[PDB]
Swiss-Prot record, chain A:
Cellular localisation: Cytoplasm
GO terms for MF: ATP binding; ATP hydrolysis activity; ATP-dependent protein folding chaperone; identical protein binding; isomerase activity; magnesium ion binding; unfolded protein binding
UniProt function note: Together with its co-chaperonin GroES, plays an essential role in assisting protein folding. The GroEL-GroES system forms a nano-cage that allows encapsulation of the non-native substrate proteins and provides a physical environment optimized to promote and accelerate protein folding, probably by preventing aggregation and by entropically destabilizing folding intermediates. Also plays a role in coupling between replication of the F plasmid and cell division of the cell.
Keyword Cytoplasm applies: yes
Main location: cytoplasm
Name the UniProt record assigns to this protein: Chaperonin GroEL
Coiled-coil ranges (or none): none
Originating gene: groEL
Free-text domain note: Each subunit is composed of an apical domain that binds non-folded proteins and GroES, an intermediate domain and an equatorial domain that binds ATP and is involved in inter-ring interactions. Forms a large central channel that appears to traverse the entire length of the cylinder with no obstruction. The central channel of GroEL functions as two cavities, one in each ring, that are separated from each other by the crystallographically disordered 23-amino-acid C-terminal segments of the seven subunits. The entry and exit of polypeptide seem to be restricted to the apical end of each ring.
Amino acid sequence: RVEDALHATRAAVEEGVVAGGGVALIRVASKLADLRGQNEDQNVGIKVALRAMEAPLRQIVLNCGEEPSVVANTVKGGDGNYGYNAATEEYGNMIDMGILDPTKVTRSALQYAASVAGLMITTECMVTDLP
Amino acid sequence: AAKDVKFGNDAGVKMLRGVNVLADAVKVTLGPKGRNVVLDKSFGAPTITKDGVSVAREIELEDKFENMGAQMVKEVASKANDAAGDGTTTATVLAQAIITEGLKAVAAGMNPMDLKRGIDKAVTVAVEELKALSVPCSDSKAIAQVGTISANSDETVGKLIAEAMDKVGKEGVITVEDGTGLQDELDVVEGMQFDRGYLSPYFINKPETGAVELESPFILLADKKISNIREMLPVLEAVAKAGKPLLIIAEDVEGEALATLVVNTMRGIVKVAAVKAPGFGDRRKAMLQDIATLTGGTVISEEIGMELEKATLEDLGQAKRVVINKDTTTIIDGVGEEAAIQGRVAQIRQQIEEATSDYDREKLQERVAKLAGGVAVIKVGAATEVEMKEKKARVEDALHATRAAVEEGVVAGGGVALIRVASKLADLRGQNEDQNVGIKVALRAMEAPLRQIVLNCGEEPSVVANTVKGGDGNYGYNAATEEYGNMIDMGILDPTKVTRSALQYAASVAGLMITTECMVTDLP
Amino acid sequence: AAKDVKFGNDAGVKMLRGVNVLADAVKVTLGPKGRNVVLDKSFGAPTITKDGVSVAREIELEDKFENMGAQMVKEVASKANDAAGDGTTTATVLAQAIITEGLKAVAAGMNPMDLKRGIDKAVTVAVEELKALSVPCSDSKAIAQVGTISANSDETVGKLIAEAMDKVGKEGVITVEDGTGLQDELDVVEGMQFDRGYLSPYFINKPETGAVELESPFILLADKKISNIREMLPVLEAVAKAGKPLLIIAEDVEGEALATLVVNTMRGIVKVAAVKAPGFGDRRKAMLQDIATLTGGTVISEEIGMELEKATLEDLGQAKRVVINKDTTTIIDGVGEEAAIQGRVAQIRQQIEEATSDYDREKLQERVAKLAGGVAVIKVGAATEVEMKEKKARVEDALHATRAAVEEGVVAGGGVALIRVASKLADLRGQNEDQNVGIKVALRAMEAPLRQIVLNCGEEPSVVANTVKGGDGNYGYNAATEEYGNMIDMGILDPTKVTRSALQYAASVAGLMITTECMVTDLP
Amino acid sequence: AAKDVKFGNDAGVKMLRGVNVLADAVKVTLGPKGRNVVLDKSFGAPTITKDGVSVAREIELEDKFENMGAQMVKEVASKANDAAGDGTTTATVLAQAIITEGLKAVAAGMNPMDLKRGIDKAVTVAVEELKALSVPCSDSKAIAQVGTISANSDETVGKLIAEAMDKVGKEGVITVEDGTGLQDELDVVEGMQFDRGYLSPYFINKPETGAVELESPFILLADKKISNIREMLPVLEAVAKAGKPLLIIAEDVEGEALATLVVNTMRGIVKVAAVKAPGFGDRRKAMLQDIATLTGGTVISEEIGMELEKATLEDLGQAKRVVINKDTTTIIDGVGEEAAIQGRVAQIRQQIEEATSDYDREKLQERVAKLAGGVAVIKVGAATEVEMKEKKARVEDALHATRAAVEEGVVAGGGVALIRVASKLADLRGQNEDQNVGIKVALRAMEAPLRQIVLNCGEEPSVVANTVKGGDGNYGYNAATEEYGNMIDMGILDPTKVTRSALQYAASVAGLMITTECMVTDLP
């Protein structure tokens, strides 16, 4: 427990702490609704990313046996660290309720995800051995 | 022949696959963002259609058990359209959802009888709630409004209905016909409607209404059962000689002579149709005479010793038009003299004076209402034949919707009334825990129509359901404009009678299907 | 290697087949009218058994997913027998029951987490009820009674247990050995027990107890981790030269030298076993020295600069017998001298005088308890070798049961306690409706053992269940006599600890299994 | 490995098909008109036999479940032959018959536990009846008679047994060896028999008796458990140097050194065999010393601090012959001196003077009986080698039969005693109706041997059974002459012990098999 807590706190002193349970990802996506790119395909690129950023909360809420698109919709409509606490199944301020991730982990998850996704979307050819 | 017999869950899963193919085909059409279904023809180009009733009619499945599931739901859902002028697709959607969760509850070991009691309790209570959500449609301004809304915002059509209903009563009989110029016309003529349909689906010469429609027909009134065709010939020939078609109203037309008429109008030899005389026993003999007076006909009854063979054209009544349904016959413009009809009315109005029983009185009051009520004929005018025929269909639709709406009022459309009443029954409970899940099955099914409409919009059904539920009264989602609001002001509504019927009929087959243990059919 | 992955219901149905083969095989044995299972051998004639533990151990299934279900249940059920000395088959029957209805409710769409919370709540409450139903077993008369009940009505075996427990305390350490004549003997000896098992299942030279049993063994005490076998050789040879076996008590014996001992006792080159030294940090160093004094050995610690290479036979402790479990080591008759042991006790009894903390005090009192407590040895006598060996088994069983009984009492047997506590919780609820069915799943599973027992009798299980539930207290069905009565008076009882553990462990895997969404295993 | 698992009737039909292949193969040989069975060899020409024990020994079945059936009946039936010297095929017939009707009753929904109780009660009562029908065989004239009947009417063989028994007691130890000329010889030699068999089937150097037979062997007596082979070498080499074989009598010979001896006599490096010392505890230490005195050996016990390493040839006892069974060891002609042996006897006869308990007394009287009893050696003479070897086999049979006959008497042979006691039990009942069919199954099964015997004669078995059951007493059918008669007069009889054992053993496997619900074995 100490070993885990130590790693988490190390990470938290570096880049801080943000709303957990999926909430910080969906919050930042809800603020980027007017983001645009050099052209139309770039725009749908941006919508792809923004919508993917909802998947973690939608999964969490689906494990709860709750309706994921209602909870997403309610969390998106709120401001700041407002979100859904899946432990207690109640909405509230995520930081007061003590449900948080170190910013470094949310950022890294996002960047690495987008990196393979990007590679994979821009793959034309695959080589492997004949079974 | 040798049968294939199935039991319990095996029979359950087959009925459920059957119902899924039916309902999934039909529900794609539902709501203002409904999709097309393509239906093949051997006749030429396939047909593209948003009409769920059309879709339904084509659905037949290869697996015999699956196909039984489909036909059961088809048969019962079409009873809604018959009762209310509309609702068959909604019934089909409701049925799919009650059946899907009920069979799940069966498989989980809950008691099918209790499940069914639960569903039925919920439906009873929901039906009282619709009654209470209903906004009445019963003055001339409301009638015009509802008629214009069903006629796609045509204030003219609404006008026409209201004028008809004013000329002959809200409950009065009203037909629609081709117009004669640009102008619409309305006039009231001698006529009558009774609750008896065609004796076989084959007399239907108008498949798009699924009706039988005859022009200047002779009418044979015969108080007796018609088995033999021997009795017919002398009259049947004399009718073919005048080149006019013929309506048979008899006690019954059975097996033999029935199949003959069916085949002999089929070849176009004579245009005939046959319906049961209305009522039973004594009230039947009397009602035949009513129609006789109306149409200047003579009743041929064997108690006076008359035979069908010794019957000429003279004996036959006549009318400018008759129209028959699955379960209705309406006689428009009867040749019968005004004096003869007036007399028959005065006569009956006089038996009303000496009826010594409540029941005798009502039965007589019903007969006078028919004979002395007449029929309003709306003739629809336009600038071209094409526009005329389209306005006629618009009027015909608006008429049925408005009829329903004066009976039981009007309620929030687009799926909203059903989800509204469900949100009010969250605390309903029954005799035991299985009954309670029955209730939940029904309540959740009641959301299926809105969820499908919102799904055809490409929106998130469970978010819209959730927002509509949390609101009050007629608040809902307008799928035409994709905005929330008061459904009645935005003019999106159903006649309560159609929402009530869709629910009751869907609950009826769902209940029967949930409580089925065995299915029997032929070996392929 | 490539995997085969399964999700939801598909995973569900596979674990349920797995569990049903396991449970069905094992449950035929249950109760006085239990049936035989035949288990095949390559060794010779197949074996015919009523021992459900034996049947379980053989069960392995061809489909990899089914087999995973079976192994999961085996693993957890056998924790009951470990904790309480009995219970494994009951756990299996409970698990089959919770799982079967839990997965049904999952397939019906209920929330798995909620189902589990419900099951857990019903278990928590039922265990409180078990505790309240329980009758203490804590005086000499009661001890004898329970002992003689577990030993098949043999008043002698009861006596023996009670005499042992009187000589050394209810919580004291007692073993059983072969006798020397007709007479039973009991004596108290220098010895000790600590909570450390064998380091690999392979040292087990007595598979029927699943124990390691060594005669006149040398004991190597080494305060340090043993990775290398290089350090061993000089001692290992000197031990093989005296022809006696060897116990290794060290901080740890890891990877390398561990695997070597495993293979080198496997070939019968030397009989070795290794166990972890007891406790951690400082209390470990001191306890190693306790064992040393007990056995007349010397501790080899590298903080004093001693190596395992420069270690002779002289350094090694000795004892007449040692016995090791999955999670126990017990040292019987240590060569250590009575003066040296008495001195160590007085020493510790003195640190007790100057402990300035509760904790340091309890920790010392526990060491003196072990060293100064000895071990009671029951040696079982009889008339022939055959009768002796059977009485020894009877005594061994009775001793485990009676140990469990002094801990937590006794409750109605033959399945009755379980059904009894279930019939008291009919009003129990949870935070919502799925939790409630969770509760109902557990409560109905609690009838399984009695229904099975009655089914082996060839009587109607639902009528016996129904009658037992209707009664109060320890009223129940005696399957031996097929009569109803007070189960405690009829002398049909289990130790509370076994009933409790069966239920807790069955509800554990059932909970895990009902909340599993994915399974992964290798492609056939 | 993955298992294949079977339940209820599936398991039943498999066990039945297995028992049928076994029983049908073996039963063709039954009685004087028994048929030949041909058994194939890779070795050369197949063998043609009428010995049902040899047939049985070959039967193994392809389907694993079937084969489990066959082996379970083989194992138990061969305990008869062990206990009584004969009966194995009879037991196979009985088992087939109880099995066949019992499974039929299980399949009919009768209660397997109650069927077993009925079978068991019938057999207990039938055994009392066998005992009452039984004729004692306990004076010299009767002993001759029984032995000459078992020896195929050879009055000589009869004489020889009687003479031996007279010289050494009815219960005394008697062996048979090759003769030295024409004359038979009988002499008494120092020697002993105790109840311990070989430690592995592999030491058997004489497979036709299934015995181990050693000539002029050295005997190692070691009071301790022999795990290591290290302790052995110094002695084992010194034994190989004299070229004589070796008997190990130790507390036990376990895993390691056991498997070594097994492989090292297998290669013919040294002829060794190992058996458990007799008895347990103190009576064991003493008895080892008895054997020591008999054979002029020294006991090597580690309580006196002696090691097996420091043991020479001097320490080893010697004898002219030893013979070991599945459950017997007999030492013939011990080198031990007459004075040393006489002194040990007088010593023990003196402990008999001061024994203060019944039990101590019997235990000592049993040891003197053994030591002071010797062994009778029958050496069989004839005119040619061939005739000698056949007479030896005849004497060997007759001896086992006559031994069994003095223990429990003699009863009507050829299937008659069993069918006789069955006709007397026609009114036997049980606690309920399933138990009663249990009784009937056992009673009808008791007919199967006589039915089989008559069937091999080519007569109608049911006509013979019916006539035999209508008579009284030892009235029955003689299958040698094919006439009815008094079985006792006609000299057709079996020792009561074999008829009793065949019944009891057949009923035992049949009962287990009838009450089996599950079978586990490996996937083919």
